[PDB]
Design a binder for these strands. Structure first.
Lengths: 286, 65, 169, 129, 188, 266, 70
RNA sequence: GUCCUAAGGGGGGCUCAUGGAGAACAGAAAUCUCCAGUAGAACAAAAGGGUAAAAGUCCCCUUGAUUUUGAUUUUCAGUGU
RNA sequence: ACGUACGACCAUACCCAGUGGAAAGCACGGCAUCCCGUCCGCUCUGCCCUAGUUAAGCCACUGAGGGCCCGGUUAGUAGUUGGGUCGGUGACGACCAGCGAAUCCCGGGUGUUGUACGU
C-alpha cells in the first residue's frame, strides 16, 4: 500500500518553521523566556551564543510578541580592530568576543528629557544594580570545556551578571570538585593553541605549516599569543566601540539593492502562465 | 535549651522532656556565630547529651555538626 | 556537473555482524573474533521479540557487531573480497547504493585458527557515501540529501568494477 | 562615586594555607597581592580572576604584604624573621632578603613617595623583638 | 506643563490589578476624521496612564532591592468570579467516624515512621515496602516448617510465598474498604 | 492516577483556596473571517503565557448548545474562551465565554468593526514583552450602570482577560504598557479597545510626565447577545475563600510587634 | 537512628527580621492592662540592646588589671 | 513460582510501530545497513485536537523510606516542650 | 533587494523532481596535542579559515500530482426552535419571526514580517 496518500497529506501537521530548519529548541525557549521565580513584571535578558565555521556570534536579546529584539551584538570578526587576525573561532576569541559584548552593553547603558521610572522612584538607600542576563547556548552541547562557557566567562569578567557554576570551565576536575585556574588562564590567553604550535613544530612540520600557515605568514609566534590577547583585552576595555572596516567590496544600500535585483529572477505572471499552459496544450495536441 | 527532640528510651520520656544520656536536644546557638550560605543567622541546632545529668548535676552536650 | 570532486564515491562504514542466536560462550567467542579482527570492542545486540520456534527470548543477547570506518574498513573488505575471489552478484547491491556479503569461515579471512574459539561465519555490509553526508547527520540544521547527490545501484556497481577490478554477475 | 559591592566577582584558589594579608596595587585594582601561611605570596590578575605570579622563598608564614607607594615594589614580611622585596611585573626577587630581626616580623611601612631621598626607598619593619 | 489633570468626577483605583476606572464621560467627536478620533482617545489614555502612575508612585511603598525598585501593592478589590468552587471538607469515612465517636487520636509522624530497630541483627530496618519486616524470612536460607502445616499445605505452593499471600489478602481487604468508602461518598 | 505525573496533573487541576491563573482557549467555528482570525491572533499575542489555541474548525454555536464548550473546558482546564465566527447577519463575531466548575457561567458576543480594525503589525513601535502584564484603564459612563448589563459584563470579562498573574509587588520598569477600554452610555454604543506604550519625561517635579504612543491592536466592538449567570451559580462563583495566612480576629487577643500573644483586660 | 535532620539548622532568621525586631524592642512600651499570653521563641540575645558602657568596662576592669600586672 | 542499589525527581543524548531494498547459516518469523515513515509504537487517560531534539526510550546524579519553623486555618488534647 | 543570528504567524511555508546562484555570508571541508565523548573523532568536542567546491544543505524560479489557505455561490436554503400567529377540536398545513448548516459549483494563491549586523 501507499503510505503517502491524500488522507495522509490532509491529516499531516507540520512542525514550526525553525524546528523544520533545525535552528530552535522551543522546549528550551519556553522555559528560558516564559518562566520565572518572581512575578515582579520585570524585563528579562538572554545572552545568545552561536558558532559558525569562521565566526562567533554573541547577542543580547529580549523577547517581544512580534519577534525578538537585539539590545547589543558583538562578533569575532570585529576583533581584528583590536588586533586578533587568526583563530577567530577558538576559545580565547570566544572569551574576547564575550568581553567585547559585555563592554558594549555597559557602554550603551552608560554604566561603564526622557528618564526611567527607576530614577523617578529611586530611594535614598538605593545602589546601582548590575546588568543581568541568562545564557542561551541553543543546540550546542554543554560539555566541560565548550566555548559557550568561554563567551559566558568573558561577559561575566566584563561585568554582566550571568548566574553560573564553574564545573563546565576548562581545567575542572570532577573527582576533587576543584577548578585548575592555571589551565583556565592558559585557555583564556590561548596557551593551548601555543602548545599545539610547539608540539607540531617539534613532531610534524608539514602539519604545522598546513594548519598554521597564516600564523607563520603574518609572523605570529606561539609565545606572543598571551600578551597579544592581553593587549586585545585592554583595548576592548578601553574602546568598546572601535570601528572596523572589512576587505569585502563596499557599496551603498541602494547600490546593493540594484546589484541583487539585477540577479533576481522575477515570478511569472498570470498571462505568461496561461500562455505556457496553452503552449503545452498545443504541444500535447500536436 | 530550646526543646527536647528525642529521648532514646521512650516517646513518653521525650514528651516529658527527660534529659538523659544520648538525648537529642535543641539548643540556642546564637553565641556561637553560625551563619548559613544565604547569610541567614542560625540560632537553633541539635546537640546530644553526652553525660548523666542525674549523676553530675549538669547537662553536657555536643553539637551535631 | 558529475565531474565535480565533491561527488566522489567513498566508503562511509563497514559493519561486521555475527548472529549466533544463542547467548553465552558462543556469543562471547564471536565477540572475541570480532574484537581481534577489528581492534575495538564489539556490541552485543538483544532480541526484540520472543520466538519459540527459534528458541529466543525478549531482551536476550543473540548477536554481536562492530562498525569500522576509515582505511581499516577498506582493508577488511579487501580481505573479504580476497576470500570471495572478487565476484559479486547483482542482488547483493542495494537500490540505495550500499552492498554486502556474508562468509562462512573467518579462518579463511587470514587469522590463525584456535580450538578455543572455533569457527564462525559473519557478514560484511559496506555503506557508500559521497561527501556532504554531514547534512543528514549533524544535530543542528539536519536536513535531507538532494536527489542528484544520492548513490544508485549502477553507480556503486561500476565504482566496484573500476576500483576493485571485480566481476559482477 | 563608589558603588556598593553586591556580588562575588571571582573565587580564586591556589594558596595551600589560610590567607593572612591582602592588598591591592596602588596603580589599579587589576593587580592584587596576598600573603599566606603556606610560606608564599601571590600576585593575582583580578580582571580575569587568574593567578599572575607566585613569590616563594620565605620559610615562615608571610604575615604582611605591602606595595610601594609608586607601585613598583612589593615587600613581604614573614614569620622567619625576614623581609623580602619583589618586582611585581616580573615576579622576581629584588636583591636579597633583609636580615637583622631576631624575632617574628609583624608589620611593614613604606616611606611616602614624596619623602624618598638619596635616590632610594626606605622601608620600616616592626618585629616581636 | 502639568502632570496633574482635573475632571468633574475623580478616578477610582484598584492597584492590585493595576486598574484605573474613569467615570467621567468621554466626549468622542461626532466627526469622520480618524486622526482626531485617535488623538482624543490617546489624550484620554494619557490622562488615565498619568493618574495611574501618580497613584502608584505616591500611595504604594517603595522598596529598593537587588532585583530592582519594587512597589508593594494592595490586594485586589475588584470582584471577579472564580473558576472552581471553594474547597470543602470531604465526607467522613467509616474509620474517621468511628475514631471521632471512640476518641481515637491520630498517630504522630514519629510514631508512624517506616523504620524500626531490629535487636537480633542490631540494625535499622523498614516495617514495610522493599525488604520490609513484613516480608521477613522470604530470602533467608533455612526455614523450619511444621509437618502438620506442610501436610495441610497444597501441592506446588511453598513456604516462601506465605507472607506474600497474607500481604495480598490484607491489601485486597483494604482496597475493598476504600472502594466501599468511595462509593458511599459518591452516593452522598 | 497511578502515575506520579498524572497525579501531579490531577492535583494541579484540583480546586484550591488560592486559584491558579486563568487559562484562555482560542478557537473558531466552521466559518471564520480573516479579520476575526487576526483579532484572535492579537488577543493571543496579548495573552500567550496563559492560553491554548485550537487550529481546527468546530461546528459549535455557543448560544444554542455549549456541551462541546464544557467538554473543551474539562479537557483543557480553560476557564476563559475566545470563540470566533462569521455570518451574513454578523460578519465578524468574537464570543467571550467565562466558565465555572466546567460549566458555562456567562457569555457575551462582540461584533468587530472591519473597517477600523488595525492589527499589531500595522503600528511601527516597540512591542510588549512576552509574559509582561499591562495596566488597565476603563473610561466612560457605560461601566457605572446600577443594573448589571452587557457593558458591565464586558468590563469584567476584559479585566479577567488582561488580569495576568496576581502579585504583591511589581518592578517600576514593568509599567510601560496600558490597555484602554472606552465606552459611553447612550444607537448602539461602540466599545473601543486600544493599547498604548508609556513614555515618561522630566517635568521639574518628583512625579514624571506620562506620554503615550499607540501599540495596537485597534478594536471597535458592538455588544450583542448575552447569556447571564444563574443567581445560585453566580453566588457560588463569587464566594471569596479565606487564605490560611489570614488570621481570624479574636476579641481581646492580639499579636504584638515582637510576636507575643497579648490579651486585654478591661 | 542516623538521620540527616540532626545535622541541619532547626531555626534560621534573616538580618531584615532581626533589624525589625530590634526596632520593635526599642519601641516597646509597658501597659498595665495588657497581659502576656504566649511568648515568641526568638534569639533574644541578638535582639535586646547591649549592656551599658560603664558596666562593660567595670565588669572586665579587674581581669584587665590582673592581666596587666600579675 | 521467580528477579530487583525501591519508586520518584532533575539534566542530557536518541527516535518509534511498519513497509521496500539488501547481507553465510537465516529459511513468512533471529541479527545488521540504507531509504520512506504525524506517530498509525510506547506511556497515560477515555478528545470532539494527550506527548516527538518528548510526557516515549537509554545514560549521569540523588535515593535521605516521608525534613524544619510558624504567634496562621480546621479538629482534638486530665501526657497542654 | 540578498546573506547571517534570534524570532512572530506556524503547510499560501508541506510531499516529489528539474534549472540557476554576482558579492559576501552560511555550508560542505582539513587535522585529532589539549578540553570533551563514542563500537566507530559517524554524532559530540577541540584546533585550522589555508586549499578544493557550489556536488549537497540553503536560497530563487519552474513543473506535475496531492495537500493547504482565502472570497463568492449554496442561502438566509435545508434544519432547529418557538399554536409563535392564522385556520384546523387537537395532531398538524401554511405563514411569521429568531437562530442558523453542509455538499456541489466558481474564482484566486503556493508565503508575509520584526530586530541587529553585514553584502
Amino acid at each position: 500500500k501507499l503510505v503517502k496518500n491524500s488522507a495522509y497529506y490532509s491529516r499531516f501537521q507540520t512542525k514550526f518553521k525553525r524546528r523544520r530548519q533545525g535552528k530552535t529548541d522551543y522546549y528550551a525557549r519556553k522555559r528560558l523566556i516564559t518562566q520565572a521565580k518572581n512575578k515582579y513584571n520585570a524585563p528579562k535578558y538572554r545572552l545568545v551564543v552561536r558558532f559558525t565555521n569562521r565566526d562567533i556570534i554573541t547577542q543580547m536579546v529580549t523577547s517581544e510578541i512580534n519577534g525578538d529584539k537585539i539590545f547589543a551584538a558583538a562578533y569575532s570578526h570585529e576583533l581584528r580592530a583590536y588586533g586578533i587576525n587568526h583563530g577567530l573561532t577558538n576559545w580565547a576569541a570566544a572569551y574576547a568576543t564575550g568581553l567585547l559584548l559585555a563592554r558594549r552593553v555597559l557602554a550603551k547603558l552608560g554604566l561603564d528629557g526622557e528618564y526611567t521610572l527607576t530614577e523617578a522612584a529611586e530611594t535614598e538607600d538605593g545602589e546601582r544594580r548590575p546588568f543581568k542576563a541568562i545564557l542561551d547556548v541553543g543546540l550546542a552541547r554543554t560539555s566541560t570545556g565548550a566555548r559557550v562557557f568561554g563567551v559566558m566567562k568573558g561577559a561575566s569578567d566584563g561585568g554582566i551578571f550571568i548566574p553560573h557554576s564553574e564545573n563546565r570551565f576548562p581545567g575542572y576536575d570532577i573527582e576533587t570538585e576543584e577548578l585548575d585556574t592555571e589551565v583556565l588562564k592558559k585557555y583564556i590567553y590561548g596557551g593551548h593553541v601555543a602548545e599545539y604550535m610547539e608540539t607540531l613544530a617539534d613532531d610534524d612540520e608539514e602539519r604545522y605549516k598546513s594548519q598554521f600557515v597564516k600564523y607563520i605568514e603574518d609572523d605570529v609566534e606561539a609565545d606572543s599569543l598571551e600578551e597579544l590577547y592581553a593587549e586585545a583585552h585592554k583595548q576592548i576595555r578601553a574602546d568598546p566601540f572601535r570601528k572596523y572596516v572589512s576587505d569585502a567590496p563596499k557599496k551603498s544600500k541602494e547600490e546593493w539593492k540594484a546589484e541583487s535585483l539585477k540577479y533576481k529572477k522575477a515570478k511569472l505572471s498570470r498571462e505568461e502562465r496561461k500562455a505556457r499552459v496553452e503552449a503545452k496544450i498545443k504541444q500535447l495536441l500536436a | 535549651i530550646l526543646s527536647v527532640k528525642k529521648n532514646p528510651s521512650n516517646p513518653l520520656y521525650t514528651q516529658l522532656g527527660v534529659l538523659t544520656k544520648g538525648t537529642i536536644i535543641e539548643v540556642n546557638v546564637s553565641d556561637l556565630g553560625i551563619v548559613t550560605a544565604s547569610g541567614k543567622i542560625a540560632w537553633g541546632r541539635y546537640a546530644q547529651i553526652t553525660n548523666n545529668p542525674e549523676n553530675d548535676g549538669c547537662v553536657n552536650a555536643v553539637l551535631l555538626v | 556537473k558529475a565531474q565535480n570532486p565533491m561527488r566522489e564515491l567513498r566508503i562511509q562504514k563497514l559493519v561486521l555482524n555475527i548472529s549466533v542466536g544463542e547467548s553465552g560462550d558462543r556469543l562471547t567467542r564471536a565477540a572475541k573474533v570480532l574484537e581481534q579482527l577489528s581492534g575495538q570492542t564489539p556490541v552485543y545486540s538483544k532480541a526484540r521479540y520472543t520466538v519459540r520456534q527459534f528458541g529466543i527470548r525478549r531482551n536476550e543477547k543473540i548477536a554481536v557487531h562492530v562498525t569500522v570506518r576509515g582505511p581499516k574498513a577498506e582493508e577488511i573488505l579487501e580481505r573479504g573480497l580476497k576470500v570471495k575471489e572478487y565476484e559479486l552478484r547483482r542482488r547483493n547491491f542495494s537500490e540505495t547504493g550500499n552492498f554486502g556479503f556474508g562468509i562462512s569461515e573467518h579462518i579463511d579471512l587470514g587469522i590463525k585458527y584456535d580450538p578455543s574459539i572455533g569457527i564462525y561465519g559473519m557478514d560484511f555490509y559496506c555503506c557508500m557515501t559521497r561527501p556532504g553526508e554531514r547534512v543528514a547527520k549533524r544535530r543542528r540544521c539536519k536536513s535531507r540529501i538532494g536527489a542528484s547527490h544520492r548513490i544508485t545501484r549502477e553507480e556503486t556497481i561500476r565504482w566496484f568494477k573500476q576500483r576493485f577490478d571485480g566481476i559482477v554477475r | 562615586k563608589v558603588h556598593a559591592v553586591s556580588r562575588l566577582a571571582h573565587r580564586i584558589p591556589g594558596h595551600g594555607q589560610p590567607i593572612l594579608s591582602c592588598q591591592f596595587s596602588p596603580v589599579s585594582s587589576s593587580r592584587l597581592a596576598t600573603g599566606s601561611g603556606d610560606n608564599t605570596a601571590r600576585i593575582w590578575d583580578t580582571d580575569s580572576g587568574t593567578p599572575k605570579f607566585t613569590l616563594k622563598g620565605h620559610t615562615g608564614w608571610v604575615l604582611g604584604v605591602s606595595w610601594s607607594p609608586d607601585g613598583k615594589y612589593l615587600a613581604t614580611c614573614s614569620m622567619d624573621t625576614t623581609v623580602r622585596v619583589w618586582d611585581p611585573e616580573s615576579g622576581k626577587q629584588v636583591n636579597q632578603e633583609f636580615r637583622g630581626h631576631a624575632k617574628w616580623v609583624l608589620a611593614l611601612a613604606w616611606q611616602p613617595y614624596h619623602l624618598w631621598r638619596d635616590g632610594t626607598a626606605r622601608l620600616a619593619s616592626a618585629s616581636k623583638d | 506643563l502639568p502632570v496633574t489633570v482635573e475632571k468633574p468626577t475623580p478616578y477610582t483605583f484598584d492597584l492590585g490589578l493595576l486598574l484605573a476606572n474613569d467615570p467621567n464621560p468621554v466626549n468622542v467627536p461626532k466627526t469622520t476624521d480618524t486622526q482626531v478620533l485617535e488623538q482624543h482617545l490617546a489624550s484620554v489614555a494619557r490622562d488615565g496612564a498619568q493618574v495611574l502612575i501618580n497613584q502608584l508612585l505616591t500611595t504604594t511603598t517603595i522598596t529598593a532591592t537587588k532585583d530592582g525598585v519594587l512597589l508593594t501593592l494592595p490586594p485586589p478589590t475588584t470582584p471577579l468570579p472564580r473558576e472552581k468552587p471553594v474547597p470543602q471538607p470531604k465526607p467522613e469515612t467509616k474509620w474517621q467516624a468511628f475514631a471521632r465517636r471512640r476518641g481515637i487520636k491520630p498517630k504522630t509522624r514519629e510514631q508512624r515512621r517506616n523504620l524500626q530497630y531490629n535487636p537480633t541483627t542490631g540494625q535499622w530496618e523498614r516495617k514495610w515496602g522493599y525488604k520490609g519486616a513484613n516480608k521477613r524470612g522470604e530470602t533467608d536460607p533455612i526455614i523450619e516448617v511444621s509437618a502438620a502445616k506442610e501436610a495441610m499445605r497444597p501441592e506446588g505452593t511453598s513456604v516462601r510465598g506465605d507472607k506474600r499471600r497474607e500481604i495480598r489478602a490484607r491489601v485486597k481487604k483494604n482496597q475493598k474498604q476504600m472502594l466501599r468508602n468511595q462509593r458511599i461518598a459518591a452516593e452522598k | 492516577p497511578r502515575n506520579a505525573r498524572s497525579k501531579r496533573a490531577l492535583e494541579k487541576r484540583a480546586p484550591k483556596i488560592v486559584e491558579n491563573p486563568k487559562t484562555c482557549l482560542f478557537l473558531r467555528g466552521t466559518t471564520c473571517s480573516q479579520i476575526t482570525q487576526d483579532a484572535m491572533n492579537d488577543l493571543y499575542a496579548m495573552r500567550q503565557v496563559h492560553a491554548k489555541r485550537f487550529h481546527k474548525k468546530n461546528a459549535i454555536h455557543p448560544f444554542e448548545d455549549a456541551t462541546s464548550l464544557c467538554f473543551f473546558s474539562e479537557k483543557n482546564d480553560c476557564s476563559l474562551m475566545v470563540f470566533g465566527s462569521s455570518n451574513k447577519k454578523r460578519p465578524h463575531t468574537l464570543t467571550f465565554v467565562r466558565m465555572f466548575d466546567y460549566k458555562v457561567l456567562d457569555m457575551l458576543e462582540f461584533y468587530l468593526d472591519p473597517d477600523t480594525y488595525r492589527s499589531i503589525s500595522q503600528f511601527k513601535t516597540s512591542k510588549i514583552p512576552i509574559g509582561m502584564r499591562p495596566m488597565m484603564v476603563f473610561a466612560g459612563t457605560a461601566f457605572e450602570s446600577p443594573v448589571p448589563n452587557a457593558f458591565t459584563m464586558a468590563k469584567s470579562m476584559l479585566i479577567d482577560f488582561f488580569r495576568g498573574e496576581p502579585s504583591d509587588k511589581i518592578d517600576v520598569e514593568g509599567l510601560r504598557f496600558v490597555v484602554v477600554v472606552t465606552a459611553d452610555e447612550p444607537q448602539k454604543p461602540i466599545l473601543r479597545l486600544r493599547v498604548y506604550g508609556i513614555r515618561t519625561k522630566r517635568s521639574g517635579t518628583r512625579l514624571p510626565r506620562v506620554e503615550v504612543e499607540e501599540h495596537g491592536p485597534r478594536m471597535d466592538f458592538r455588544l450583542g447577545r448575552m447569556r447571564e449567570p444563574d443567581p445560585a451559580m453566580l453566588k457560588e462563583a463569587m464566594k471569596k475563600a479565606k487564605t490560611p495566612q489570614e488570621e481570624r480576629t479574636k476579641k481581646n487577643i492580639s499579636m504584638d510587634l515582637l510576636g507575643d500573644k497579648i490579651g486585654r483586660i478591661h | 537512628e542516623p538521620n540527616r535532620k540532626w545535622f541541619t539548622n532547626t531555626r534560621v532568621i534573616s538580618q531584615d527580621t532581626l533589624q525589625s525586631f530590634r526596632e520593635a524592642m526599642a519601641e516597646k512600651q509597658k501597659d498595665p492592662y495588657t497581659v502576656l499570653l504566649k511568648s515568641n521563641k526568638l534569639p533574644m540575645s541578638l535582639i535586646r540592646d547591649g549592656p551599658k558602657l560603664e558596666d562593660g568596662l567595670k565588669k572586665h576592669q579587674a581581669k584587665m588589671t590582673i592581666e596587666r600586672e600579675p
